[PDB]
Amino acid sequence: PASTDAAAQELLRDAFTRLIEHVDELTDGLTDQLACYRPTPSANSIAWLLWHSARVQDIQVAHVAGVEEVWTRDGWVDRFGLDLPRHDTGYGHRPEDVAKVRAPADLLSGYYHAVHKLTLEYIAGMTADELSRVVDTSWNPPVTVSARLVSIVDDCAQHLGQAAYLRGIA
Amino acid sequence: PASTDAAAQELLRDAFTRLIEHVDELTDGLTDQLACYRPTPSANSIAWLLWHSARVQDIQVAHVAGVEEVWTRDGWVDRFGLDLPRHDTGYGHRPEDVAKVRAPADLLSGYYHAVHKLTLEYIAGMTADELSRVVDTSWNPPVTVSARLVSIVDDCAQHLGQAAYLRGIA
Ligand SMILES: [Cl-]
Ligand SMILES: [Cl-]
Incomplete structure (x- = not known):
């Protein structure tokens, strides 16, 4: 570590903080009826997008950090009590599975x-050094920590943006 | 400048590159009918979201960089020929203005x-040093270059994510 690491630390902290700010906006005054709206029968809902975004960030950050997902560490999976396998993130969900994500x-x-x-x-x-460390050799180009973190922000930003669009028409 | 600037340069390059990758995906096989779809009469369309995202990135990056927007520099505004004022970015658009953005x-x-x-x-x-430079004193906290760049990525990621959602239901 060195003092010049602060710049990238700040870029990452700011990018991830925008996501949680969107979560605060999206959940404020969010009722169950709005959270479950689907504009077409196969489309993702706000509740699914919020949950999936959190699950994806949890599993992907926990992997690069080498720690347990908070989903299980603190029993969030049991507080939710969804009718789904305990490890589900939504990556494998069919259109019908979307309706099970209600909280x-x-x-x-x-x-x-x-x-x-x-x-x-x-x-x-x-x-x-950590930013250039490879975490996934199975893809070409092999995935560095830097690229994985950018991937997480982008995926979550997209899903949270979709939820905001739906909140305006739901 | 120093060699330790490379880490933040790479984070920024990767984040902005994901946006252009989404643009390639969204525009491939995009017809005019799909580009203009609005799921409800007041909702934003794919064409508007793609154009607005590009305009926002252009005006905001040009401001921090101290250069001219490419919209005017290379005559893109004239190639588009939209029935809108030449400087419009979409920031000021009403629901009816969305229908004018067709290209x-x-x-x-x-x-x-x-x-x-x-x-x-x-x-x-x-x-x-550039990352910590303030570019907007009118807001509290004053906006650094770092925060402004994160804001641009996040806003554009959200709009491009909304366009991808619409592409799947349009
Ligand atoms: Cl899953
Ligand atoms: Cl405008």
């Missing part, structure tokens, strides 16, 4: 806030 | 690619 806004927000805390703790000490 | 997919992609080139040229030499 109060406070639980969607609380789980994402716990994932955000986990993420802040990992990125806070990020070094140049 | 072939190749022009939407070409303009975003020119904005992406402008962005790559700016972020390529990013230094720690």
Whole structure:
């Protein structure tokens, strides 16, 4: 570690903080009826997008950080009590599975806030060496930590943006 | 500038490159009918989201970089020929203005690619000092270059994510 790591630490902290800010916006005043709206029968809903975004960030950050997902570490999976396998992230969900993801806004927000805390703790000490470390050799180009973190922000930003679009028409 | 600037340069290059990759995906096989779909009468369309995202990135990057927007520099505004004021970005658009933003997919992609080139040229030499420079004193907290760049990526990622959602239901 070196003092010049602070710039990339700040870029990462700011990017991840925008995601949690969107979660606060999306969940404020979010009712169950709005959270479950689907504009067409196969389309993703707000609740699914909020939950999937949090799950994806949890599993992917926990992998690069080498820690347990908060979903199981703190029993969030049991507080949600969804009719789904315990490890599900939504990556494998069919259109019908979307309707199973139903939870109060406070639980969607609380789980994402716990994932955000986990993420802040990992990125806070990020070094140049860690950013260039490869975490996935199965893809070409092999995935560095830097690329994986950018992938997480982008995927979650897209899903949270979709949820905001739906919140305006639901 | 210093060699330790490379880490933040790479984070920025990768984040902005994901946006242009989404543009390539969204515009491939995009017809005029799909580009203009609105799921409800007031909702934003794919063409508007692609154009607005490019305009926002152009004006905001050009401001921090101290250069001219590519929209006017290379006459993109005239190639589009939209029935709108020449400086419009979409920030001021009413629901009815959305229907005026209609352009072939190749022009939407070409303009975003020119904005992406402008962005790559700016972020390529990013230094720690530049990242902490304030570009907007009117907000509290005052906006640093680092925060502004994160804001641009996030806003554009959200709009491009919304366009991808619409492409799947249009
Ligand atoms: Cl799954
Ligand atoms: Cl405008």
